[PDB]
Amino acid sequence: TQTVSYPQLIDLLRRIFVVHGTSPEVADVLAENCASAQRDGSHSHGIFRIPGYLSSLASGWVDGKAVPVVEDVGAAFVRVDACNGFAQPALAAARSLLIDKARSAGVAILAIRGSHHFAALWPDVEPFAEQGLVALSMVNSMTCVVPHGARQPLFGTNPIAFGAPRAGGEPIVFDLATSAIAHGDVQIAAREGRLLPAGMGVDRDGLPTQEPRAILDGGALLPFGGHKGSALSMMVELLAAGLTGGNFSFEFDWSKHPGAQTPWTGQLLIVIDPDKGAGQHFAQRSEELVRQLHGVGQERLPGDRRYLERARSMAHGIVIAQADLERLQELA
Amino acid sequence: DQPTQTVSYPQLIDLLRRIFVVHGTSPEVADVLAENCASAQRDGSHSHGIFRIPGYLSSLASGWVDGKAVPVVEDVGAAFVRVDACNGFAQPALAAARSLLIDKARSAGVAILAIRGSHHFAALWPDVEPFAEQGLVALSMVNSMTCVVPHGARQPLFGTNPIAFGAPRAGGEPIVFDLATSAIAHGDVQIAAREGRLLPAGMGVDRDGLPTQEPRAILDGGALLPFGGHKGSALSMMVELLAAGLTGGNFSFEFDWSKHPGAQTPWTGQLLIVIDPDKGAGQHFAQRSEELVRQLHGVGQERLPGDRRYLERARSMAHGIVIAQADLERLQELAGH
Ligand SMILES: NC(=O)C1=CN([C@@H]2O[C@@H](COP(=O)(O)OP(=O)(O)OC[C@H]3O[C@@H](n4cnc5c(N)ncnc54)[C@H](OP(=O)(O)O)[C@@H]3O)[C@@H](O)[C@H]2O)C=CC1
Ligand SMILES: NC(=O)C1=CN([C@@H]2O[C@@H](COP(=O)(O)OP(=O)(O)OC[C@H]3O[C@@H](n4cnc5c(N)ncnc54)[C@H](OP(=O)(O)O)[C@@H]3O)[C@@H](O)[C@H]2O)C=CC1
Ligand SMILES: O=C([O-])c1ccc[nH]1
Ligand SMILES: O=C([O-])c1ccc[nH]1
Hints:
Two copies of one chain form a homodimer.
Chain A: E1 2-4, H1 6-19, H2 24-39, H3 50-58, E2 69-74, E3 77-81, H4 87-105, E4 107-115, H5 122-130, E5 134-139, E6 159-166, E7 169-177, H6 183-192, E8 201-202, E9 208-209, H7 212-216, E10 220-221, H8 226-242, E11 265-272, H9 282-295, H10 304-316, E12 318-320, H11 322-331
Parallel strand pairs in A: 3-4
Antiparallel strand pairs in A: 1-12, 2-3, 4-11, 5-6, 5-11, 6-7, 8-9, 8-10
Bound molecules: NADPH dihydro-nicotinamide-adenine-dinucleotide phosphate (2 copies) and pyrrole-2-carboxylate (2 copies).
One NADPH dihydro-nicotinamide-adenine-dinucleotide phosphate sits between chains B (45, 47-48, 120, 122-125, 142, 144, 160, 162, 177-180, 184-185, 187, 303, 305-309) and A (148-149, 227-228, 231).
PDB class: oxidoreductase
Keywords: NADPH dependent enzyme, oxidoreductase
Assembly: dimeric
């Protein structure tokens, strides 16, 4: 293996995106995002995704030079047309306006449509919590999850992310796919030749399977927590696509674009000033909840794993297989 | 077996309203709770229908909850409303702020209602459904009482903490889900214990933290597990933070009714987010949601969230609400008949 510093990884990835057609602005956003995931140990959404990013860009499936169009449509409502570009640049373009509205009105929504999201969601909500705001986000992906009780896939892996500030530490953040397992991890499991525990998916005939290959080859995934996770996944379709104006997870396909891997959908973000008109401090309440969680024995809270890995990465550098580093350098 | 009888929806509402008034609630509170409880029974939401009347009354009799509390509606932002439930029920507080909340949601595009110091002893779908019937999307969270073990923990901390969601659809009743983040609702654990039966495995543990299917074992020093492992636990944590942390109400472990024999209602809070899905939009959300429903039937999902309740609702309006003869008599007695 090898070791690359966080800032070096960002520069390396930024060069790669520019070399492959993205605007400098988009390259800055994606490089920081991807590098951040690797820094935190979010393996299925770190450098593992570079090949997919590049194959998707090559066909024009996703526009690496798209210019987001921000629409100020309400005292607490912002819409942004991603114009077939990535979701992150669209969020970045409307972020300042969104925060101004959230702080002024108390809460504000950002509805992104026509966007491609190929990353973790915690990077989208954590920054808001770092600034003392609470953020909830939903993104619908690509069809591959069978609704509870159904016979064929329809929903995407549809993740939900939540970020909240705490007085005595880094933001409390959770980021979870509503599918029993993330598709990226099914791909990694297939590559490593590992079987999955029961309940993650079914084969092309709809029969339960533990073989990641069977799931990937015409099969499908199942929602986490049965009917409850399925209901949440339905909500993600409705909020990230139905409300934003973007495609539902089943309203697009890659058949005409060789190598395309990015979903072309949308994203919803709700940002709240938890202390608007409050006779207390939210950050103090959340800190107390953390103290109580430790008190009952929960050593690991959502996000802890990443924060520990993050600290390691900043102190000793990001561990990367020498082979992967060389590949990135050649791509750059 | 217990002989049964039917009572119409309006008759049940009148009966429950009388019960609440006779037992110390204001008329506004009685109207709201009577309709809410009766509506749950009508839809077949047993754990939050008339089954809850005894708990409501014992909570009121003990002085734990103020049945005559007057909600204080606080307009704190263009899109933000807070309500001090003043140790009263959550539903009357929501009713007091409903019009203002809707005005803000339609004007600003989205609006939040943060209720603090409230007691919620019911289903959450009654809270979000009305907004959806008016073309708005609503998401709500309520934290309850400590009994759920956080993922990886050894003792309970979170409440059953439900999340509810309602959205309009062009060709039918609102799309609505209402789920506890625990593996089972505490109310249904009580019903199982009452009926002397066991629960499915993998939903709770006994006082020693060992798996159990005995509802009594869970109720007597035991605890429930979050649904869907670590993900359900994360969602439950979110509910504590949103329904209590953000509103100002107590977390599920921050209230004690040991000094109020008979108290059963959590004294916490509730968060509601109401959105105009078409604010500044170039499309119609209701059309998009109808398409999703069509696609869901297309892939074979016959039962969508809410369908079971809408079916029971239809049966109740056509044949009346089925009620055990003994339960009806008890309700009639409580009403004064
Ligand atoms: N459309 C898109 O862009 C999609 C993106 N994804 C992404 O892939 C992802 C990985 O998601 P998923 O597989 O669901 O992730 P997991 O199942 O690993 O994690 C869900 C989360 O659970 C918390 N968690 C995990 N294990 C524990 C534990 N033992 N105790 C307490 N908390 C725990 C995590 O913390 P922690 O982070 O510290 O490990 C995190 O918030 C996300 O980053 C997601 O955004 C997935 C589908 C679609
Ligand atoms: N603090 C409080 O006041 C608390 C209240 N509760 C209440 O008790 C409750 C009952 O909750 P819980 O036990 O989680 O409910 P369930 O596990 O029954 O239902 C969750 C929900 O799942 C949908 N659903 C259930 N089964 C299926 C299926 N097979 N296919 C598709 N969708 C399905 C339901 O539809 P559908 O409605 O049609 O049945 C509903 O939206 C709620 O009403 C809740 O609000 C729970 C904890 C705390
Ligand atoms: O891993 C997944 O499920 C996924 C879909 C889109 C991005 N990641
Ligand atoms: O059924 C439950 O879990 C519950 C708690 C408060 C009201 N209902």
